[PDB]
């Protein structure tokens, strides 16, 4: 291979992109480019980034000391207080560890699902003018260069204007 | 300075859910968790690229 690859997901993720999470890139005779999808990215970032705050719920219960640091305590009641503290501490440690590990599973699963839905929405738009390429990638069978490309990203792609041309080359 | 919970060696003024400074606190301190660190994800699965030269 002389030039670099162009393939999308199902193979690997984009390395050189900083604008937004979800995006896509094209290729044709005119050149090559990149662009990010903002409406999808804004929805995703807003729902995932705020998870940190939702963990710290403001149940404003106030606690007070029961253990004297400069201590002169008995030995029985001291043992009773010691036992409960470790049991509750283990409950919090066990509860907290599973909660975070449990929520990470949803974030990875949810984000992967939002990506697929966007991929689904493009196949419906192209309808019969494009054939799936099996690497999370599409093959357009009619000639767009720069603005016909921009329409696909913008939901204004009226397939009816190109169907008579695109369908004449998928099956010769 | 302002704060709302304290411990032996100072103050734990912060805005995070869990703390690992001391098991004993007074006031509205965060819950004590007995672990060094507990990372929380804020992204998606990573899949770096490979080199093609064939």
């Amino acid at each position, epitope marked *: 291979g002389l*030039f*670099g690859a162009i393939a999308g997901f199902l193979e690997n993720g984009w*390395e050189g992109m900083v604008d937004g999470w979800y995006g896509f890139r094209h290729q044709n005779a005119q050149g090559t480019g990149q662009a990010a999808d903002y409406k999808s990215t804004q929805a995703a970032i807003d729902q995932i980034t705020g998870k940190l705050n939702r963990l710290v719920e403001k149940t404003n219960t106030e606690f007070e000391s029961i253990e004297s640091e400069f201590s002169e305590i008995e030995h029985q009641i001291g043992n009773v207080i010691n036992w409960t503290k470790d049991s509750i501490t283990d409950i919090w440690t066990y509860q907290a560890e599973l909660l975070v590990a449990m929520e990470n599973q949803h974030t990875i699963d949810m984000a992967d699902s939002e990506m697929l839905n966007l991929y689904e929405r493009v196949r419906k738009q192209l309808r019969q003018n494009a054939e799936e390429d099996g690497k999370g990638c599409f093959e357009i069978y009619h000639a767009c260069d720069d603005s016909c490309m921009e329409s696909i990203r913008n939901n204004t792609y009226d397939h009816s204007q190109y169907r008579e041309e695109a369908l004449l080359n998928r099956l010769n | 300075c302002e704060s709302k919970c304290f411990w032996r060696g100072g103050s734990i003024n912060t805005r995070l859910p869990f703390q690992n400074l001391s098991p004993r606190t007074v006031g509205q301190c965060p819950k004590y968790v007995n672990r060094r660190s507990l990372m929380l994800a804020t992204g998606m699965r990573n899949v770096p690229e490979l080199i093609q030269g064939r």
Partner: antibody
Amino acid sequence: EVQLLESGGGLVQPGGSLRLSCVASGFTFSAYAMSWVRQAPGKGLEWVSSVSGGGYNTNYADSVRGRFTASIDNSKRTLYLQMNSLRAEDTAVYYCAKDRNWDPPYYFDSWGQGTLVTVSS
Amino acid sequence: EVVMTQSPATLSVSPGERATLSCRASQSVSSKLAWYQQTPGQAPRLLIYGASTRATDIPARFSGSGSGTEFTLTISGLQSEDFAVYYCQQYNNWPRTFGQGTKLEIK
């Protein structure tokens, strides 16, 4: 971790030209853009060229448009610059640097050691 | 085509004192600006991107702010080896022009 290395400096006279080369390793060579930069003796920096999108796109500064041609070979991870029609005004040190974006170069991040190019009568 | 000016063209500061620099623009850039460091007989080094974000391996004494057309960069404590030539560059429009440059020296 990251390493860029270059070579090809030497004397030249009008009409002739050099062919600089800069090698890259330690990072995926097909996932970032590359650029050249020069600095005249004791003067300010200037942009000369860059390559985008794996090699299908190129751009040049207005001072060397048509004269200098850039290219890329992603099998050997090598960066080229075929200069032509030198006028001795470009005598300066050259560098090859790596940026952090794919289609637009954005801002250059890492640099190498560079090389010296000079012209004389 | 952006053309930028760095003021003053040269500055001098004593060791251990605060140092501040600025770079001005001809038309709005909106945080699409960067800064560099370079010593003579060497290669440059990238310092700040996004006009407010430090790049990797940039000590805590480097910071700055700016928006629209004017930017500020203060080195909080000038150590024995912080003296070098600095540059401001914009990546908003072609060509990504550099400018006059600036040399920092011991007073």
